[PDB]
Amino acid sequence: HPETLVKVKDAEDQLGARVGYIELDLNSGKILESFRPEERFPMMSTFKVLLCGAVLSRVDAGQEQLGRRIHYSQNDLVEYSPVTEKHLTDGMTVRELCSAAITMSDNTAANLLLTTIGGPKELTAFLHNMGDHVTRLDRWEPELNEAIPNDERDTTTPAAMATTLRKLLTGELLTLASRQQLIDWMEADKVAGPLLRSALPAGWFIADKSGYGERGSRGIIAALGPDGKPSRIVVIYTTGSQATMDERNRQIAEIGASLIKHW
Numbered sequence: 001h002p003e004t005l006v007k008v009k010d011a012e013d014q015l016g017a018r019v020g021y022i023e024l025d026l027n028s029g030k031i032l033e034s035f036r037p038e039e040r041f042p043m044m045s046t047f048k049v050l051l052c053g054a055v056l057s058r059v060d061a062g063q064e065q066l067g068r069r070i071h072y073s074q075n076d077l078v079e080y081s082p083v084t085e086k087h088l089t090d091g092m093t094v095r096e097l098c099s100a101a102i103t104m105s106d107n108t109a110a111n112l113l114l115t116t117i118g119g120p121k122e123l124t125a126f127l128h129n130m131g132d133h134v135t136r137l138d139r140w141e142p143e144l145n146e147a148i149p150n151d152e153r154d155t156t157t158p159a160a161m162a163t164t165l166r167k168l169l170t171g172e173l174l175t176l177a178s179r180q181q182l183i184d185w186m187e188a189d190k191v192a193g194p195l196l197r198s199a200l201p202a203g204w205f206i207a208d209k210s211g212y213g214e215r216g217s218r219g220i221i222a223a224l225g226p227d228g229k230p231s232r233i234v235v236i237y238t239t240g241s242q243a244t245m246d247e248r249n250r251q252i253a254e255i256g257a258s259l260i261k262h263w
């Protein structure tokens with residue numbers, strides 16, 4: 001709606017920064033509203049959904065098994081590793097690492113999964129081969145969150161990210177079991193409380209992944225809808241603002257409150 005578009009415009013003004021927005025219909029793929037859809041924004045932690053899609057694609061092919069146990073060390077631990085720091089002795093399974101990367105945004109879990117597929121280049125090659133020639137990953141955690149202005153590394157566009165998520169969640173690429181595992185992890189997100197979830201009415205489904213980085217970077221990707229079933233995809237990114245994290249949270253939640261109210 002124009003009201004949601006106005007709310008996105010307001011956010012840009014109140015944050016003093018670019019906001020990228022896409023609202024996409026899940027069944028048909030039709031864009032319902034957009035804002036700066038072809039502009040690039042840092043993905044930040046939102047890339048972890050695409051990373052575990054690559055992992056699931058390798059699981060489907062038998063190049064990976066979800067039960068496979070990965071043992072790592074203390075020198076592999078990077079900043080923000082709330083789950084992987086607890087499993088240095090027993091290791092973790094690929095399934096557990098994807099749950100940690102998506103549900104808790106564990107950074108070491110993300111790096112360990114990137115190694116299983118061959119690094120940020122193979123993730124980009126995976127995205128390339130599924131029809132996304134726009135989104136690119138180039139660096140590891142935490143360096144991928146630098147959000148240097150006009151740097152194209154580790155970026156997506158609202159339009160590319162929204163269509164790629166759709167394909168991963170509902171497209172022919174992954175097997176039904178893998179599509180279901182990916183949306184399960186996302187539905188179990190526990191670090192996106194103050195964003196779209198804060199605007200969600202009772203009984204609504206949401207499966208999302210948020211992120212933040214340097215230079216005021218903040219974002220979220222989600223599939224959501226009424227009656228306990230997802231029906232649409234929303235992508236919101238921003239970068240450049242000196243605003244506090246709580247401000248950016250509130251601006252994104254008000255965009256969500258807006259699109260929920262004219263659903």
Ligand SMILES: *C(=O)N1C[C@H](NOS(=O)(=O)O)CC[C@H]1C(N)=O
Nearest residue numbers: 044045080105145191210211212
């Ligand atoms: C993702 O952008 N990141 C991982 C972690 N959690 O933040 S999130 O919940 O918004 O994903 C810490 C911050 C950030 C990072 N610097 O990697």
